[PDB]
């Protein structure tokens, strides 16, 4: 045989997606949650499960506290990460981890101990023969199919922009805004308290997130949309809670994602995502801005609100000089783009030389990743 | 209806057939052959028999009953025997085996195969 | 009409036919031929098998990819093979071959012709 397939695991704050190198789609997609029972079990012989990992934790949300191992792109709890990776390797893919190389993705700017801890856990516990760490928005450009453009990745943890021209990345132009989907979920809860509906527990946060995913969109003109929603009730929708109660979302549908463009709603003084993209473009040199304007690529699940592409194009066109081409490239499957391009990175023949070997880790320790990746 | 689930259950079918043949190869000694992996492991008696023929060691005798609690007890005894045989099982519950989740049963079989070599 | 590039263009409009007719004879030993010197050289497989015919030693496996990056891989493998055999090339990159620059492709073909025979 030779050249065995190397598995790729994309971990974000929201979901974990794992799959083989050659496939165009991941095998397993499941949320990164670890739940533990609150109450005291009373039936003898029911069986004892200490912790719930993955989809069945979303099934049994009532009797558990939902917790997230990743917050803002940084792994806060590492035992939960070991649980997540074990459930990924042995239950979802059911493959031996010590016989395949592993590819992993991470945010651009993060604490430097995170890479070392991932490398140490991947080598010492799972005994993988090789592993590599890559930036998510670089892999998004591989999934795009072009070697020139600026990638704007918005996920559950962070939002980051990076420009790459002719295969060369400019490190000083990288910006990392902290707005993400979980902040939008919290803001949606806060504005849903205005109509009388109260969501406090961790299990109901998933319900609010589903409401956000199903009944939200980005208005093209926000203040016009406010006038239209105040004038009539045509911009109203109904949602059904799991217990049968019916709520009416009404006005709030375009108020939740509008906070992405004006962060002052959350009390943050940082600029919007469109201004972040424009500033990342403007930090580059004069000659490469023309190619960066015409190859802006959207990525991440958070960018699947309907109408975000037209709004982003309008704002960037307003900021940019009038005589240039501005076009926003939005793949219909962009939620998996960080995975998909990563799979392409595991298929190239020249990539076999830059795996981090076990012998190199033994010689240099966990710091070798800072020399080998990026 | 989706590409991800199509690839997933395309893998599940082949792995299920291979696991069924392996389990029947080790269960040919006792007069028990399982036709479907998901349906027959729901009781939990054949899994206890499989463990005590693989390890060559006694296990506690199963509780006799038709009801759900007896099935949970029978699965829990075998899970506890695997647990004291130093083997690390993640996201494993007796009610998951009783309810018949595909991924968890296949993962338990895979872990048993890889740890009892 | 820019007499300089006019004289240039009359040079490579004949130079192209000369190189195409030269390369088709060596490529005819395999069941392959090229109708255009710029467009079929973009994929990178044709020059790889041209080097197969000329050198007599095999090259690494071409990548079965329709992407631009796979084309860059395929051209880069052959360029590394040319660099292995003492051949000197100036500002010759895989993206130049993929983008179909006229004079760089012609210079690469002319360098191959000069070096091998």
């Amino acid at each position: 045989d030779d050249d065995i397939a190397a598995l790729v695991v994309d971990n974000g704050s929201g979901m974990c997606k794992a799959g083989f190198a050659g496939d165009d789609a991941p095998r397993a997609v499941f949320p990164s949650i670890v739940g533990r029972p609150r109450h005291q079990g009373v039936m003898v012989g029911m069986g004892q499960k200490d912790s719930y990992v993955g989809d069945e934790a979303q099934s049994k949300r009532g009797i558990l506290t939902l917790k997230y191992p990743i917050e803002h792109g940084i792994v806060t709890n590492w035992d939960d990460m070991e649980k997540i990776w074990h459930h990924t390797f042995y239950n979802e893919l059911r493959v031996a981890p010590e016989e395949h190389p592993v590819l992993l993705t991470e945010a651009p700017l993060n604490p430097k101990a995170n890479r070392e801890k991932m490398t140490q856990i991947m080598f010492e516990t799972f005994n993988t023969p090789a592993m590599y760490v890559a930036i998510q928005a670089v892999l998004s450009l591989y999934a795009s199919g072009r070697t020139t453009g600026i990638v704007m990745d918005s996920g559950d943890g962070v939002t980051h922009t990076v420009p790459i021209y002719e295969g060369y990345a400019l490190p000083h132009a990288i910006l990392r805004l902290d707005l993400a989907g979980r902040d939008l979920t919290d803001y949606l809860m806060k504005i849903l308290t205005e109509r009388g509906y109260s969501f406090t527990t961790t299990a109901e946060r998933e319900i609010v997130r589903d409401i956000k995913e199903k009944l939200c969109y980005v208005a093209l003109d926000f203040e016009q949309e406010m006038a239209t929603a105040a004038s009539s009730s045509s911009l109203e929708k109904s949602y059904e809670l799991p217990d049968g109660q019916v709520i009416t979302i009404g006005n709030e549908r375009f108020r939740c994602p509008e906070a992405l463009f004006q962060p002052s709603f959350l009390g943050m003084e940082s600029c919007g995502i469109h201004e972040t993209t424009f500033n990342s473009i403007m930090k580059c040199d004069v000659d490469i801005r023309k190619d960066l304007y015409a190859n802006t690529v959207l990525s991440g699940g958070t960018t699947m609100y309907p109408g975000i592409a037209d709004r982003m194009q309008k704002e960037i066109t307003a900021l940019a000089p009038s005589t240039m081409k501005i076009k926003i490239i939005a793949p219909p499957e962009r939620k998996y783009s960080v995975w998909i391009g990563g799979s392409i990175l595991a298929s190239l023949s020249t990539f076999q030389q830059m795996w981090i070997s076990k012998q190199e880790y033994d010689e240099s320790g966990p710091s070798i990743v800072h020399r080998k990746c990026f | 209806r989706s590409r991800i689930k199509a690839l997933a259950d395309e893998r599940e079918v082949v792995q299920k057939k291979t696991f069924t043949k392996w389990v029947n190869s080790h269960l040919a000694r006792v007069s028990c052959r399982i036709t479907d992996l998901y349906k027959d492991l729901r009781d939990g008696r054949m899994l206890i028999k499989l463990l005590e023929v693989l390890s060559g060691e006694m296990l506690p005798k199963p509780t006799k009953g038709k009801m759900r609690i007896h099935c949970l007890e029978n699965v829990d005894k075998a899970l506890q025997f695997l647990k004291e045989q130093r083997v690390h099982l993640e996201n494993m519950g007796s009610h998951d085996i009783v309810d018949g989740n595909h991924r968890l049963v296949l993962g338990l079989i895979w872990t048993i195969i890889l740890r009892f070599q | 009409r820019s007499r300089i590039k006019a004289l240039a263009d009359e040079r490579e409009v004949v130079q192209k036919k000369t190189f195409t007719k030269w390369v088709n004879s060596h490529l005819a030993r395999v069941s392959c031929r090229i109708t255009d010197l710029y467009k079929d050289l973009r994929d990178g497989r044709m020059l790889i098998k041209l080097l197969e015919v000329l050198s007599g030693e095999m090259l690494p496996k071409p990548t079965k990819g329709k992407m631009r990056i796979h084309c860059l891989e395929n051209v880069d493998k052959a360029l590394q093979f040319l660099k292995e055999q003492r051949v000197h090339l100036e500002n010759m990159g895989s993206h130049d071959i993929v983008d179909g620059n006229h004079r760089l492709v012609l210079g690469l073909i002319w360098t191959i012709i000069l070096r091998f025979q």
Binding site: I4, D23, E333, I344 | - | -
Partner: peptide, 30 residues
């Protein structure tokens, strides 16, 4: 029996055949 026969590792790579990975439709998505 061996690792390779037990685990159904796909020999074929679907990503290589697709010319445009940008233009994939996993779901109609409405």
């Amino acid at each position: 029996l061996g690792y390779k026969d037990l685990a159904a590792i796909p020999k074929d790579k679907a990503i290589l055949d697709i010319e445009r990975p940008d233009l994939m439709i996993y779901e109609p998505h409405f």
